Amino acid sequence: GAQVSTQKTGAHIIHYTNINYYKDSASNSLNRQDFTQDPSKFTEPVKDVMIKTLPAL
Amino acid sequence: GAQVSTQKTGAHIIHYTNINYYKDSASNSLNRQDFTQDPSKFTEPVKDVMIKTLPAL
Amino acid sequence: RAVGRVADTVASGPVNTEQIPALTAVETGHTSQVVPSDTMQTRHVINYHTRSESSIENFMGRAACVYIAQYATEKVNDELDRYTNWEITTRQVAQLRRKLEMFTYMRFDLEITFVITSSQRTSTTYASDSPPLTHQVMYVPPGGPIPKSYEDFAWQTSTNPSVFWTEGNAPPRMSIPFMSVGNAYCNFYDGWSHFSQSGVYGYTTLNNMGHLYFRHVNKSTAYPVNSVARVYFKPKHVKAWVPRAPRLCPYLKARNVNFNVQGVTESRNKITLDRS
Amino acid sequence: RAVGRVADTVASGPVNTEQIPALTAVETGHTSQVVPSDTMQTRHVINYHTRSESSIENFMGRAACVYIAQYATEKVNDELDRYTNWEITTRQVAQLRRKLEMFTYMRFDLEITFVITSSQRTSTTYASDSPPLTHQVMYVPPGGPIPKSYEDFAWQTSTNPSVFWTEGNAPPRMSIPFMSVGNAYCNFYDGWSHFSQSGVYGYTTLNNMGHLYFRHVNKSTAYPVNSVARVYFKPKHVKAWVPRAPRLCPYLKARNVNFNVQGVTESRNKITLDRS
Amino acid sequence: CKKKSCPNPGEIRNGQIDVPGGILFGATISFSCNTGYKLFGSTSSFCLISGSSVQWSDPLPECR
Amino acid sequence: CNRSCEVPTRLNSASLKQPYITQNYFPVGTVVEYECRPGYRREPSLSPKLTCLQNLKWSTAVEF
Amino acid sequence: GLPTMNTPGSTQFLTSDDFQSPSAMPQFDVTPEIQIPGQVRNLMEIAEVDSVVPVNNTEGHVNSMEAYRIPVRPQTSSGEQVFGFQLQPGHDSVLKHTLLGEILNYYANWSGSMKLTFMYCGAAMATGKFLIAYSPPGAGVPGSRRDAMLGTHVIWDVGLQSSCVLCVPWISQTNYRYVTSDAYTDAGYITCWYQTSIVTPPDIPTTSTILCFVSACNDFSVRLLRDTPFITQQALFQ
Amino acid sequence: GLPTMNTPGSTQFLTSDDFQSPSAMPQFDVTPEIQIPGQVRNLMEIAEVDSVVPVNNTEGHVNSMEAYRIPVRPQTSSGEQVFGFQLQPGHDSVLKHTLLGEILNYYANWSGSMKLTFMYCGAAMATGKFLIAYSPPGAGVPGSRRDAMLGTHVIWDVGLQSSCVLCVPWISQTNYRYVTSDAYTDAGYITCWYQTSIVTPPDIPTTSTILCFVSACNDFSVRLLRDTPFITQQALFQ
Amino acid sequence: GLPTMNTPGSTQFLTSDDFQSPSAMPQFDVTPEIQIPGQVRNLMEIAEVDSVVPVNNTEG
Amino acid sequence: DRVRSITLGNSTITTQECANVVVGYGVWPTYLSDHEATAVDQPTQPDVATCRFYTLESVKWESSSAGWWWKFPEALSDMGLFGQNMQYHYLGRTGYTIHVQCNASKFHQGCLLVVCVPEAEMGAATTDHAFNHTKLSNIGQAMEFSAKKSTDQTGPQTAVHNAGMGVAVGNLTIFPHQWINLRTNNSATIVMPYINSVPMDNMYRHYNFTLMVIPFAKLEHSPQASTYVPITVTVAPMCAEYNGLRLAGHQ
Ligand SMILES: CCCCCCCCCCCCC/C=C/[C@H](O)[C@H](N)CO
Ligand SMILES: CCCCCCCCCCCCC/C=C/[C@H](O)[C@H](N)CO
Known about the structure:
Largest sheet of chain C: 6 strands, antiparallel
Helix content of chain A: under 10%
Chains A, B: VP4
Chains E, F: Complement decay-accelerating factor
Largest sheet of chain A: 2 strands, antiparallel
Bound molecules: sphingosine
Number of domains of chain C: 1
Keywords: Echovirus 30, mature
Number of helices of chain A: 1
Shape of chain C: elongated
Order of helices and strands of chain C: HEEHEEEEEEEE
PDB class: virus
Chains C, D: VP1
Oligomer: part of a larger assembly
């Protein structure tokens, strides 16, 4: 059961191959390809939403 | 995801196999099989085209 | 756009309107979301800049040394015994400790590497023929039988994991799952150890991860040799929760968060600037 | 025909015409495109000759040494300290420097190889039993904390990449992406460093690629040993822009393009030839 | 403790001041004049200690 | 003083002129001139001179 | 067996690789996760959050709370300078030790624009106007308000909304700028000038305070990991 | 585990191989490319471009601009020799230090024909005719114009078009010729003879100048990479 | 990485094996072949050809 | 035919013995697109007020001449609104059209090489000595190569057979060039696009290229001919835009 995913190349043959050998999941490689982010918990932790064009007060 | 391309043989079993292992693109092999060329930027850098049989002046 | 790709600046024009994107209130505890195209005129550039090197797997995923374990082949004291030990804690170095006290709760799988470098002890003479030495690294869980000495049958590794290594080869590597009993590795534990608010304060009471016993498998050497075992932790599949402010003052103790006070930043001579 | 295959000569006959393929004008700055079948009678040969060994990947894609890093196990001076350093620049050797100053702007991925060869220092006696020495090569980025001495905890490689190597094995190899901040590696930078046209002149101000720190991991040796670390750069996935004229006079300095003058070519005795 | 800043070198009228290493303690700067100009003074300057504060070792050329 | 370069390189088709051949003290920025052996002839495109650099090393000696 | 051949790079310990490695506790049951609030998936989530900048460092005021307090007072002549610092968000003494300073000092490059959010912490009857300016590093430091009005600027009016965000844009010839400053990628200067004055009613004290917060916009990006020059050690901790 | 067996060639460092190798900065974001003008994809693109050849090397004229100047003057007898050199475009002193010389000296073989483009740099009222000849290396050097008219030749007439391209063809028994010359693959001789004379009106100086450019055609090819014997060193540069 | 194990016979130089080996001149363009007459594809082609035998060796 | 006419801005240039136009490396000068750009500000693009044929000072072709080199844009630093937009802006991106013109007669002889060398980094005359910023490029006067080697203490290397950079001077014909051959040619024109590894850069600490003209065949005429032939350069920017408006530089 092979897995073929996208390599990390620059933005103006682009694949790689991963076979998990060991039976656990602690024995995997690093998960270097997760770039999801949600910064509204720290930037906008407010109860009433505040539009950036309206006055906040 | 295997890639099979043409070996470099002389001109009067002719394949090879490349599996990219690492997740980046800096970790690839050399790109020894690009022979495209365009020498008209340095030989003919002129604005008006000059036919080789007509006089240039 | 792809994931982790920063946003680009839209075009803008000379406005004259009742919309104020620059005026806000910090009293609400809300960081402003002002695009640069809100307070001036900008073009339409396209940003291909990825945020790859900022994620917690790319950030924490580099191996950092945590201990320097010294042992020998002829006992001279109890600091350079025939074996040694290391109570497992990542708070003994100054580099990895600061990277782990940037978040309150972490949950990471580990992979451990040992770089074991023997070196001949000074003596009158040194000429000998030595077989390549073999090292044993046993991981005693919290509560197991520790080896009181060398030539003891607690080193039998009957159930504890143990690695062996003949000198000259690649360094050993093993991977470790999320070994806690809670649901996250508490880097900070603001509390006591006993219920009557006494005992020991802080994260010492929560760090119960065992020991790590090093020894030479080879029984003798004609002239003794002092080995140095360095342990290289590297987190992977890491989650991180509740980010802390990064620590200003440098550390003092490997179990406390004791510190000396210092200024917040480096001092200049005047608040303004002067040049025409 | 296939790619990179040079063109063949078509057949031709004895012409008598108003077409002049031989007469042209160099004043237009245009190199002539005269086929040999334009000025004489040629047959129809078929050229199978490929231009494989001329492309920039086949040309630059061979590993060339760039530094000879010397360090030891007992400090005698600051040129042969217990550690050493190397400010990363490819302008210290004479062979690879000329291959990179044939183009103005390059953009290449790198892969680095170290050939580390220890050799025993001269002394009164040499007989000892030595464990195989271990080397650490740390790459400090531009601005990081450099190690002021051996036995310093800047060598902890907490975030900087570091390779380790026990003697006897294959040489270490790691690959490096396009590490610039612009869009190409400027080999030539005709300008100054400060805005008032002063400071330092040339490409010294643009070469900011860091350092490279070498040391022995093994703490002691009974009789000291001087190691020699040679670094082997090799570009790959290379693009090249704006070709320069190749450099005539040999180099003097590793940061300047300073040079002595010489003639354009080797001199003969007379302009003509004489033999019947 | 960190290094002590020397005074600012200012500007040579019709000349060029090379500051390639800052103006801290032990830093070396240099001077030169324009085309068709004569240099009266030392070519390069150095910041050394004079009692309690840091000063330059020599004043600035004109140029002439 | 006190930091002298080593002896100039043994070129197979060049030798040192007097008085550069007998002395063993060469400071930085010194010059040495080369006449060649009685089998060889001077190439006019090159300059038969070598200098000491800052780091006690002679400049790149091409065959003269 | 299968014929192999070892490439260069075998039996090495690259400090920044990724490889599978055999587990020491096989078939281990890790404890189930729970939904802890406040997850960080990216170090740029923290760097988009404000933090008050110690602009008043002069001199020996870092050992008190007077570091963060930018003082303003009613003037006698308009056009004077409130504060001023270089824009080096990983190396300048004002900005390298804040929350945008300690995360940026772990890296070597940085891209994208920033913010500089202000907050008048004076009396509710006082009134001022200020001109906050960011000048690109061509012609040096702006000398007066007439020299600093030509660059980027924002006229902040103090009213019921007690904050104003100067968004320092990204003007550079290079795609990235170095954290520890080199003269090729110098980034500019941030000034602030008295636009009119401070005008107060009677029975109000003179010395006020302006708090300055720094943040990053949604186009910030960092690169080239390294180790911070802030936490040092000599020996191991015991 | 899997049964393998190491072939000969393991743990070696071949200086001219290609192998994948683990990256030291993983998930690094390189900077985006831009369309810089003037891309070179091949070293033969540079070798198809003209370059003036220093034919007048005699003697000690290499330390001036008199190296490139081939002099012509009104003659007393026709059929005299203008210049002459061997056709060794990587070893001969005329041709090894030009733009076709410095690229060809990085290699060991070369194929294909070449060009030799001329340019009369005399007065606009002067008039000449020349006979440029390339003779294959059988019978030695051509002695006079009668011996050189039998080989390949081109009669150049000086008019409004002030250039003429002798295209030296490819006549050889071997598919390739060596750059550093061996006697098995000798390539010939290039001469140039006064076809009629130089005839000038009065009040015009006698000594003129002809510039000679060398190039490669569209069938040139090179092989067998090596290192150039032009840039030497003794110690490292500091 | 992948778990392997070396069989007996590793790091040896058998004088009569066949193994791939990395080329020292990559992407080299060899010269094109021509039809030379008289090709030998087998050493038994020569051994089917006559040759006069020195039967009268005696003596000297 | 042999006639061409260029019109840029409010000024035009006519030639009657013109060889051709060498458009750089095959690229006409253009504006910065929305995907090559980096600066997030809005650029100022003056069409007619900047892009026009600024003429320099005419240099004299002596019989013993060696050559001259200009360094752009710093040789265009006190001409029109170019030298004013260069002060009030941090960045700047432009292409050029360089028109070198020299007429003598049909009784003179000589041949110039007119080349535009991108980033001609020049070596020192006396080594271990940083040379002056005005011995490389003054504001309006060109510079002059020497006939022999230089022995200056704080200047560049002006031996013209080594072209200043240290290369052979005859190998300069890959940089986009022409020739002014007084037998046929009269004027040489090169259209040079913006050549740099960054989209926009500073205009004062960086000379993007270098216009060198070098007499290969020297000027020789009769003694009773005209003993003064001048060489004028007429360079015009094209597709210029600037970014990051701040106060006037350039310190
Ligand atoms: C064969 C040898 C195997 C060795 C097995 C050792 C694995 C145990 C390592 C524990 C992993 C977590 C380390 C502790 C981190 C803490 O949560 C924080 N640093 C708090 O101090
Ligand atoms: C574990 C050790 C890793 C070592 C990482 C070093 C990578 C950095 C190498 C920089 C690559 C570019 C080298 C510089 C080339 C320049 O553009 C030109 N030579 C200009 O001088």
